[PDB]
Amino acid sequence: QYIVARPVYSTNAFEENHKKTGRHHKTFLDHLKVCCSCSPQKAKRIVLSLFPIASWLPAYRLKEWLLSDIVSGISTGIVAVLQGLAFALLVDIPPVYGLYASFFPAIIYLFFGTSRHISVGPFPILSMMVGLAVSGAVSKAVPDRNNSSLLDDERVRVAAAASVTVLSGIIQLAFGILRIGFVVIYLSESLISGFTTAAAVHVLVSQLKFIFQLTVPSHTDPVSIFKVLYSVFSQIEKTNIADLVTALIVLLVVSIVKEINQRFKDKLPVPIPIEFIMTVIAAGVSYGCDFKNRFKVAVVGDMNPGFQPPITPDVETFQNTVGDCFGIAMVAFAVAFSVASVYSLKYDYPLDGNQELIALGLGNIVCGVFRGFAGSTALSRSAVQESTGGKTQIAGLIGAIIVLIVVLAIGFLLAPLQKSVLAALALGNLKGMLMQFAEIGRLWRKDKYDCLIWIMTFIFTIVLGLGLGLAASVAFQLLTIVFRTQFPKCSTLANIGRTNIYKNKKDYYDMYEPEGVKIFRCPSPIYFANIGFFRRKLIDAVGFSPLRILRKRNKALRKIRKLQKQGLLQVTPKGFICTVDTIKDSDEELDNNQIEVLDQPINTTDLPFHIDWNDDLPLNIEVPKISLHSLILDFSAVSFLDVSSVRGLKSILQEFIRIKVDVYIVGTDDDFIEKLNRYEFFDGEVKSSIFFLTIHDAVLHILMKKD
Amino acid sequence: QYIVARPVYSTNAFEENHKKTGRHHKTFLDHLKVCCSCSPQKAKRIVLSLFPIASWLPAYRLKEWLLSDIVSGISTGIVAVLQGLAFALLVDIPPVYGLYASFFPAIIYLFFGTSRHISVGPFPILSMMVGLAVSGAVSKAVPDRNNSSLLDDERVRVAAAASVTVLSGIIQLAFGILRIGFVVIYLSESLISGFTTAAAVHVLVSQLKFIFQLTVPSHTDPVSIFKVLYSVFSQIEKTNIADLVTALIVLLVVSIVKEINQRFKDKLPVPIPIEFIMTVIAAGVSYGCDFKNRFKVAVVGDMNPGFQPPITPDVETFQNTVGDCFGIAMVAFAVAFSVASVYSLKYDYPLDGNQELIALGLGNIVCGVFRGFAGSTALSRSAVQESTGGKTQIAGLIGAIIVLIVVLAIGFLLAPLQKSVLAALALGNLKGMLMQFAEIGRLWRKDKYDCLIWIMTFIFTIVLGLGLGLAASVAFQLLTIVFRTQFPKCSTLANIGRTNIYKNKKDYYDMYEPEGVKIFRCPSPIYFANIGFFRRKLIDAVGFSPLRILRKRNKALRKIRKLQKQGLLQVTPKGFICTVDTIKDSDEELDNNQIEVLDQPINTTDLPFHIDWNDDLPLNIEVPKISLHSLILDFSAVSFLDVSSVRGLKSILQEFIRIKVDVYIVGTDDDFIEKLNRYEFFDGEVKSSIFFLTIHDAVLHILMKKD
Ligand SMILES: CC(C)CCC[C@@H](C)[C@H]1CC[C@H]2[C@@H]3CC=C4C[C@@H](OC(=O)CCC(=O)O)CC[C@]4(C)[C@H]3CC[C@]12C
Ligand SMILES: CC(C)CCC[C@@H](C)[C@H]1CC[C@H]2[C@@H]3CC=C4C[C@@H](OC(=O)CCC(=O)O)CC[C@]4(C)[C@H]3CC[C@]12C
C-alpha cells in the first residue's frame, strides 16, 4: 500500500523548511591554479602517461607471454608484408613504398601507444583516400617547366604521398596535444554502417584495374566511382584471361578457407595461414612456368634493397591538400580507436583516447619523412594478431622485424608475384562490410530516423566520395536531432482513480478533470525550433487566445469610460445602473500608432465597482467569456531552455496573467530553476511562487485557494 | 494537506485495472485517400487560398480605409522610387533597372500575397548578394571571342542579374509548391542578430565607393570586405570633397529628423518625409549651381523612358550560380516572413507561410524576365507604409503607380541627383542594425551557448561572406544543441522527510537512503553522443563494474568445479565441507578464443547447495563482494532514445541482471514504453515488469519484496 500524509509544498516553502548544504562555486581561476601547479608526484604521472612503455615493460610476465608473442608476431608480420605490397597499388606508387608504411608506425607505436592488441600499418580505405588526395594535388600544381617520362610522373606521386602523410600526422598530433580526443562520439552507428557499406563498394570497384589488367586514368572527382566504372567497361574486350582466372581461383580458395577458421575457432590451434600459402603457390607457379612471357601478366617488379634517404615536405602540396588531410586524419583516428576499444573491453585494460592521437601522429610524421604513406590499424590484421595469441606489442615489434628482413634481404623473392593475386587478397576481407546491406530492413522497422541516416550516408559517400561524403553525413545526422523534436506530441492530462496519478486525457475511460483547471504537457526540451509550435498547441488546447480577449476587454473598458464621463451611465459601489436603453452603437476605430494601447494591463482601480468580465456588461457590449482560471504546465520532460524559449514563454505567461488566469509550472529540479534566474525571467508580474513540486500539489493548492 | 491512500502500481498492473480506450492507427494509405479526394467545398478552399484577392477585395471597408490607403501609397511610392534608384548602384548596373525592381513584384503581390502591411521591392543586403553573384558569374563565363567597351561590360551584368533573379524566383516558387515553408524555424534569434550586425558592416563598407567617389574593382571572394577596404584606402588621396561634404550633411539631417519621428510618434499626424525633402533640395541645388562642371561629381545620368523588351534567361549563367541563388532565395523569404509576422501579430490576421513563397517567387520571375533584379520587403519601407496609415495592399498599388509615372514621364528630373546623396540615404537605416552590438554582453551573462552562436555568426559572415557564412552559421548552431547535452549532470537521489519526495543526495542535510538501493537520474535525452558518458557515470555512481565482478564470479566457479570433480572438496545440500587446508593456488590462465566464456550467465543448478557470492568461499578464493541489490533509474527527463542508446542500455541492464541486481525504470509515459517495444528491447531476461510509475512505487515494492 502507498500511504502518504504530507503538507502541500511549493518549491519556495520547501526550501524554507529544509536546510540546504551550500556548495562553493568553482569559477575560471581556481581551475587554473588547480591545473598548473606542479608536484613531485604530478610530473611523474604525466611522464608515465606520455611513455607507457616505461609502465608495461617492467611488468612483463615472461613465462606466460613470450612464446605466444613470438608466434603472433611472425604470423602477423607475413600478413603485414603482403598487405603493404597490396595497398601501395591503391596509391599508384611503386610497391616498395608500402613496405615502409608497415615498418615505421609499428616502431613508433611500440613506444608511444596504449593499446596491446593493435597492429599498425596501412588499410585499404585510407590508401584510396591518400591516392585521391595525391592525384588531386598533382593536377593543381604549377606547370613550371621524350623517352623516359613515365618514371618521372611516379616520382612526383611519391613526394605528394609523403607530404600528405606528414600533414595528416601533424593534424593528428596537434589534436592529441589539445586534448580533444572525444570527437569520436559525433559518429552514430548508422552513419558508420552506411559509410562502411559504401566504402566497401569503392574498394571493390577500385580493384578492377588489376584483375582485368586494364589502364585507367587518375579520376579525382565528386563522382569518381562511376568514371572508374566507365573507364573499365569501355575497354573490357582487352582483358587478360590469365589475370582473371588466377584472381578467381585465389579469391575462391581464401574465401572458403577464411570461414573454416571461424566455423572451427575451437578444435584448431594457430589458424591456417592461407594468404601466405596461396602467395607462395602463386609466386612459385608464376616462376618456372614463365607467366610473364607465355601470357602477358603484370608482376611486382624488381624492388631495390634498402631504405630511402629522408625527404623534405613540399609546402605547395601543403597549400592545396588541407581539406583532404583533415578527413584522412579523422578517419584514421576513428577507425583505430573503434578497433582498439573492442579488445580493451574484451581484456579489461584502460585505453587513453588522447595518447592514441599522439602515437598515430608521430608514427605518420616519421613514416612520411622516410617516404611511406599514411595509415593506422587494419581490422583483419589486428584480428590475425589477436587470434594467434598476441598478448602485447612485442608482436608488433617482431612483425616490424620481419618487414625489415624483407626490405633489406629477401626482396628478390616476390618478383614473380602476379599483381592480381595481391588484388584478390584484398577482396577477401569485404564479406563483413558487404553483409551490412541487411540493416536497411532492420532499421526500417525500429527507428526510421536512423534508416534515413543510413541511406543518406550511403548516397553521400557513393556520389560525393569518401572525404566530402563523411562531412555531409555528419551534418545530416545533426539535422535528424532537430527533426526528432520539431513537432512533439503535446497532450492534456486528467486524473485517474481520484488519486495523485495524471495521464493522457484521450487514453482512459473515466478520467476526472477539475472545473476550470487545464493541465498541459510538452514531452521535449523547448528551444528555437520548437517554441512557436508549443505556443500554437497550447492556445489550441486551452480553447482561446489570451491576447485577443485582452484586446476585447480593453475595447469594452474604453467604451465604458467614454459612456461614463459623458455622464450617461451611473456608477455605484454595486450594480452599474444605466440611464438609456440603446446608444448609437458605434464601433470606434483607432488608427495605427495608437492600436498598441489595447495590449496594456487593465487597471480599473479608479472605478469603485469591481468588473467581472464573465457576466453580461450593462449595455450591449459583447466581450467573450472564458471558464478557465488556472493552468498547470507539466515541465518534467523539458530538459533545457534557451533565449528564444525564455522570451516566448515569458510572453505566453504575461498574456495569461493579465487575463486573470493563474499559471503554475510543475515538475522541475533545482538546476532548472537556478538556470531560470540567470535569464532575468522573474519580475513583479511573473513571480517565483508559480513553481510547485508535483501536479497534485498544484491541484490541491488550487482547490483550497478557490474556496 | 496531501493525503493519498493507494495501491502500488507497476505500469502493467495499472493497465490491468484501468480499461484503455483503443485508438485506430493511421498508416500511409488512409492519409492518401483523405488528401486526394475532391469535394465541391474543397476546391473552393484551395482556389481561394491561391488567390486571396478574391477574398479581401469584396470585403473592403471603403469609408474607413480608402483615404488612408491613398496617403500611405503616395508617401511610400516616393521612398520606393528613391530606394530603387539607390540600390541599383549596389549591383553596379544603370540606375533605371532599380525602378523595374520596384514595380513588377508589387503588382504580382497584389494578386497572390497574404500580407496587408508589406511593401515589396528591393533591400540592400539582397542587392549586395545579387551583385556578388553577378560578378562571380561573369568571371566564370567562357571567353568566347577599342573605344566603346565599358558599355558592353554593363550589358552582360544586366543579363546576369536578370538570370540570377529568375533562378531565385524559380527556387522560391518550387519551395512554395512543395509546402516546406516552415524552414524559417531553423534560425534562432542569436544567429539572426549576429548575421544582421555583420551585414550592416558589409553595407557600410560597400557605400564608400560613392561617398568618396573612388573606383573599386569587383571583388568576389571569401574575404571581399577587406579587399574592398584595401582598394578604397590605397587611393584616398584622390577623393572628391564636394561628394563628401554633401553626404555628411544629408546623413546628419536625416539622422536627426528620423529620430524626432520616433520621439514624437504622438502629437504629429503623417510623419515628416525627409528623404523626399532632402532629395528635392540636393537635386535642386546641384542644378543651377552646376555641380557637374564646377566640381566633378558623379550624377545619376540620363535615363531613357519606357520599359525594356523581355529577355531570355541564359542557362550558362544558371549553371554556375546555383549555390548563390539558393542563399538569395532563402534570405529573401526569411526576411519577408519575419517582417510580415510583426504586423500579422499586431493587427490579428492569419499569415500563410507557403503562399508567401509562391507570391515572392512569381514576382521575382516576372521581375527578372523584364530585366529587374531580385527582392522582397524592406523593413524601413514597410515601416513607412504602416506608420502612415496603410490598411491593405491598395497602398502598394498606388506606390507602383507612382513608380510607373516616374518611369514613363518624369524621369528627366533626378538627372542632377548627386549619387552620394543616394548613398547617404541608405546609411540612415543602419542605426537599428548597428545597435545590436550590445548583445554580446547581454547574452554573456544569460546563456553562453547563444553568445557563442552570436560570435561565430559574426565571424563567419565577416570572413566568408553573406552567402556561405549563413550556411556555416546554421551548421554551428546545430552543433551547439549537441554541445548542450554531451555531459549532462547526472546525480544520485535520496529521500527527504520520510515521504514521497526524492532529491539530490548532495544538496540537503538529513536525507535517508535505503539499504542496498541506489537511485540514479540522468536529466537529458540519451542518444549516440551521450551513452558512453551515461555508462561511465552510472558505474562510477554505483561503486563497481558489473562485468568485472561477473568475470571474477565465473573464474571462482571454474576453480570450484575443477576442485570438485577431482573429488577433493565435498558437496552437501548445506555447508561446503572441505578436505585439505591449502592447495597449490594456481592462477589458471585461459587463452584467447576461450576468454569469452567468462561473460556467460552463471547456472549453478547442477550443484545442490545455493552459492552466496557474499560470504567467504570455502578455500582461499577471493571474489569481491557488493552490497547492492536494487537499482532505480529515473527516466523522467529522458525525452527520446535511438538505436545506439537502446543497444547500450540493453548491455548495461543485461550486465546488472546477471549479477543478481534487480533493475527498475521509473517515470516514463506510455509513448516511451510503446516506442521501446519496436526496438525489440524485451526478451526472456529483460522483461517488461521493470517499469513502474514513480520512485516511491519502486521503493515500496522493494521494501516488501525483500521481507
Ligand atoms: C538530393 C540529394 C538526395 C542528393 C544530391 C546529390 C548531388 C549533390 C549530386 C547528384 C548528381 C551529381 C552530379 C552528377 C554528374 C556530374 C558531372 C560531373 O562532370 C563530369 O562527369 C564531366 C566532366 C569530367 O569528366 O570531369 C561533375 C559533377 C556532377 C555535376 C555531379 C555533382 C553532384 C551532383 C549534383
Ligand atoms: C543510381 C544513382 C547511384 C546515381 C544516379 C545518377 C547516375 C545515373 C549518373 C550520375 C553520375 C553519372 C556519370 C558521371 C560521369 C560519367 C563519365 C562520362 O565519361 C565520359 O567519357 C564523358 C564523355 C563521353 O560521353 O564520351 C561517361 C558518363 C558517366 C559515367 C556518367 C553516367 C551516369 C551517372 C552515373
Ligand SMILES: CC(C)CCC[C@@H](C)[C@H]1CC[C@H]2[C@@H]3CC=C4C[C@@H](OC(=O)CCC(=O)O)CC[C@]4(C)[C@H]3CC[C@]12C
Ligand atoms: C588548429 C590548430 C590548433 C591545430 C591544427 C594545426 C593546423 C590547422 C596547421 C598546422 C600546420 C599548418 C600549415 C603549415 C604551413 C603552411 C604553409 C603556409 O603557406 C605558405 O607558406 C604559402 C606560400 C606563401 O606564404 O605565399 C600556410 C598554410 C600551411 C599549409 C599551414 C595550414 C594550417 C596548418 C595545417
Ligand SMILES: CC(C)CCC[C@@H](C)[C@H]1CC[C@H]2[C@@H]3CC=C4C[C@@H](OC(=O)CCC(=O)O)CC[C@]4(C)[C@H]3CC[C@]12C
Ligand atoms: C579546433 C580545430 C577544429 C580548429 C580547426 C581550425 C581550422 C578550420 C583552420 C585553422 C588554420 C586554418 C588554415 C590557415 C591558413 C591557410 C592557408 C590558406 O592558403 C593561403 O593563404 C594561400 C595564399 C597565400 O599564401 O597567401 C588556405 C586556408 C588555410 C589552410 C586555413 C584553413 C582553415 C584552418 C585549417
Ligand SMILES: CC(C)CCC[C@@H](C)[C@H]1CC[C@H]2[C@@H]3CC=C4C[C@@H](OC(=O)CCC(=O)O)CC[C@]4(C)[C@H]3CC[C@]12C
Ligand atoms: C577558426 C575559425 C574561428 C575561423 C576560420 C576562418 C577561416 C575559414 C578563414 C580565416 C583566414 C581566411 C583566409 C585569409 C586570407 C585569404 C587569402 C585570399 O587571397 C587573397 O587575398 C589573394 C588573392 C586574391 O586577391 O584573390 C584567399 C582566401 C584566404 C586564404 C582566406 C580563406 C579563409 C580563411 C582561412
Ligand SMILES: CC(C)CCC[C@@H](C)[C@H]1CC[C@H]2[C@@H]3CC=C4C[C@@H](OC(=O)CCC(=O)O)CC[C@]4(C)[C@H]3CC[C@]12C
Ligand atoms: C581581425 C579579423 C576580423 C581578421 C583577421 C585577419 C586579417 C588581419 C587578414 C585576413 C584577410 C586579410 C586580407 C586578405 C586580402 C587582402 C588584399 C590584398 O590586396 C593586394 O593588393 C594584394 C597584393 C599586394 O599586397 O600588393 C591586401 C591585403 C589584404 C587586405 C589582407 C589584409 C589582412 C587581412 C584583413
Ligand SMILES: CC(C)CCC[C@@H](C)[C@H]1CC[C@H]2[C@@H]3CC=C4C[C@@H](OC(=O)CCC(=O)O)CC[C@]4(C)[C@H]3CC[C@]12C
Ligand atoms: C529540388 C526541386 C524539387 C526544387 C528546386 C528545383 C531546382 C533545384 C532546379 C529547377 C530548375 C533547375 C535548373 C534548370 C536548368 C538547368 C540547366 C541544365 O544544364 C544544362 O543544360 C547545361 C548544358 C548541358 O546540358 O551540357 C541543368 C542545370 C540547371 C541549372 C538546373 C539546376 C536545378 C534547378 C535549379
Ligand SMILES: CC(C)CCC[C@@H](C)[C@H]1CC[C@H]2[C@@H]3CC=C4C[C@@H](OC(=O)CCC(=O)O)CC[C@]4(C)[C@H]3CC[C@]12C
Ligand atoms: C528539398 C530540397 C532541399 C532539395 C534540394 C536539392 C538540391 C540540393 C539538388 C537538386 C537538383 C540539383 C542540381 C541538378 C543538376 C545540376 C547541374 C550540375 O551541372 C552540370 O551538370 C554541368 C555539366 C553538364 O552540363 O553536364 C551542377 C549541379 C546541379 C546544379 C545540381 C545541384 C544540386 C541540386 C540543386
Ligand SMILES: Cc1c(CC(=O)O)c(=O)oc2c(C)c(OCc3cccc(C(F)(F)F)c3)ccc12
Ligand atoms: C578498410 C576496412 C576493412 C578491410 C581490412 O580489414 O583491412 C574491414 O574489414 O572493416 C573495416 C571497417 C569495419 C571499417 O569501419 C571502422 C570505423 C569505425 C568508426 C568510424 C568509422 C568512420 F566512419 F569514421 F569511417 C569507421 C572501416 C574500415 C574497414
Ligand SMILES: Cc1c(CC(=O)O)c(=O)oc2c(C)c(OCc3cccc(C(F)(F)F)c3)ccc12
Ligand atoms: C537590409 C535591412 C535593413 C535596411 C533597410 O531597412 O532596408 C534594416 O533596417 O533591417 C534589416 C534586418 C533587421 C534584417 O534582418 C531580418 C532577418 C530576419 C530573419 C532572418 C534573417 C536572416 F538571418 F535570414 F538573414 C534576417 C535584415 C535586413 C535589414
